[PDB]
Scaffold this active site. Structure first.
Site, PDB file in Angstrom:
ATOM      1  NE  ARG A 176      -5.662   6.261   7.020  1.00 28.76           N
ATOM      2  CZ  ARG A 176      -5.167   5.767   7.908  1.00 28.76           C
ATOM      3  NH1 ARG A 176      -4.138   4.933   7.980  1.00 28.76           N
ATOM      4  NH2 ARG A 176      -5.613   6.144   9.239  1.00 28.76           N
ATOM      5  CG  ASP A 177      -0.396  -0.215   2.358  1.00 31.42           C
ATOM      6  OD1 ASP A 177       0.340  -0.416   3.138  1.00 31.42           O
ATOM      7  OD2 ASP A 177      -1.145  -1.083   1.648  1.00 31.42           O
ATOM      8  CB  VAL A 178       3.229   5.358   0.128  1.00 30.89           C
ATOM      9  CG1 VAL A 178       4.404   5.366  -1.036  1.00 30.89           C
ATOM     10  CG2 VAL A 178       1.884   5.905  -0.570  1.00 30.89           C
ATOM     11  CG  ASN A 182       1.056  -0.737  -2.519  1.00 34.63           C
ATOM     12  OD1 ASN A 182       0.703  -1.911  -2.815  1.00 34.63           O
ATOM     13  ND2 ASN A 182       1.033  -0.316  -1.409  1.00 34.63           N
TER      14      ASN A 182
END
Ligand SMILES: NC1=NC(=O)C([C@@H]2CCNC(=O)C3=NC(Br)=CC32)=N1
Length: 340
Positions: A176-178, A182
């Site tokens: 939920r935050d690629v 990251n």
């Protein structure tokens, strides 16, 4: 639903270390880890570069007493309002960190805490993130504007896909935050998915959304659906990462003002030119049909039409992957950082 106290969460962790800070001369330590500098401050956590035994480490600092004050509204199921502090969010982030063990994910080597301050011990990825943001994405400098060669991109994409295989399939976790931020790289040069602060466990392969980084959010988030398939959400986000790697810029979601943003994604078609097109005018090579063929499979608006992690992995694009491309790049890129 409700997770317990931090103590209850770490009750099953086998390398929980008791906090011990101290000062020897001009130097500040956390359990023998010497504090050098902070690598990145995310204002929900900071990441600290440390030294122990002529080896470098990176320690993610969290603070309960600071995080439990920050309290946004979430709205419950039952009319009567519910409140969630950013510390609740960390409770879930812990649980997750607590069971990631993967050579394609950033796996912690131990957790140091006093049940308020938490330090998560990670390996130091000497090349920071995949790309760095400042008004735009860049590799090393704003004055030197280099594009990651395609032969190297492949590896990065292949490597993250493998991460996806583990989190989706083995762990049942949605990232939920690629984001380029990251996707971390060392000197050797491996690529590992990191930062689980928006990550959560799937329910029958699905998630309850409106959470992450706006420009990386899939079009689904803008329909009347409430449960979206978790895998495909991560995949879309990787598509944006690929787009960003391609033209060093965010797609149709070019920041400025964000109604333009949220009104475009769900219906507007993505424009696919040649690398420097978007980046030419804030400064004043390119790519093939096959390159966009692959990126479009990622950035399809209907998620059911969107390529799986399975199909992507065994695609003609990544067929000619060579880790020697990523190795040289990472080894050379590291040479340019050393004294920069
Ligand atoms: N968003 C992030 N969650 C993280 O755990 C990190 C790390 C810690 C892993 N190891 C490193 O060396 C890093 N270098 C940099 Br820059 C960031 C990080 N970022």
């Amino acid at each position: 639903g409700p997770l317990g106290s931090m103590k209850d969460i770490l009750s099953n962790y086998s390398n929980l270390i008791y906090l011990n800070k101290y000062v020897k001369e001009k130097d500040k330590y956390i359990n023998d880890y010497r504090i050098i500098r902070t690598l990145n401050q995310g204002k929900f956590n900071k990441i600290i570069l440390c030294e122990k035994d002529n080896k470098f480490y990176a320690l993610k600092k969290y603070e309960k007493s600071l995080l439990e004050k920050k309290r946004d509204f979430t709205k419950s199921n039952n009319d009567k309002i519910s409140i969630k502090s950013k510390y609740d969010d960390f409770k879930n982030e812990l649980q997750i960190i607590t069971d990631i063990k993967n050579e394609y994910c950033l796996t912690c080597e131990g957790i140091i805490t006093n049940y308020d301050e938490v330090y998560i011990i990670y390996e130091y990825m000497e090349n920071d993130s995949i790309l760095k943001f400042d008004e735009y994405f860049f590799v090393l400098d704003k004055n030197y504007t280099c594009f990651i060669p395609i032969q190297v991109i492949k590896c990065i994409i292949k490597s993250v896909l493998n991460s996806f295989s583990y989190i989706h399939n083995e762990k049942n976790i949605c990232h939920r935050d690629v984001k380029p931020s990251n996707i971390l790289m060392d000197k050797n040069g491996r690529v590992k998915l990191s930062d689980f602060g928006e990550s959560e466990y799937m329910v029958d392969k699905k998630i309850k959304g409106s959470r992450g980084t706006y420009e990386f959010m899939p079009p689904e988030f803008f329909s009347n659906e409430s449960s979206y398939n978790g895998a495909k959400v991560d995949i879309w986000s990787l598509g944006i990462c690929l787009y960003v790697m391609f033209y060093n810029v965010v797609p149709f979601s070019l920041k400025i003002s964000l109604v333009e943003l949220f009104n475009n994604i769900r219906t507007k078609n993505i424009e696919y030119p040649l690398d420097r097109n978007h980046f030419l005018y804030p400064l004043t090579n390119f790519l093939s049909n096959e390159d966009i063929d692959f990126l479009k499979l990622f950035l399809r608006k209907n998620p059911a039409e969107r390529i799986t992690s399975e199909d992507a992995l065994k695609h003609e694009w990544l067929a000619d992957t060579n880790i020697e491309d990523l190795r040289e790049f990472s080894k050379e890129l590291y040479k340019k950082r050393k004294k920069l």
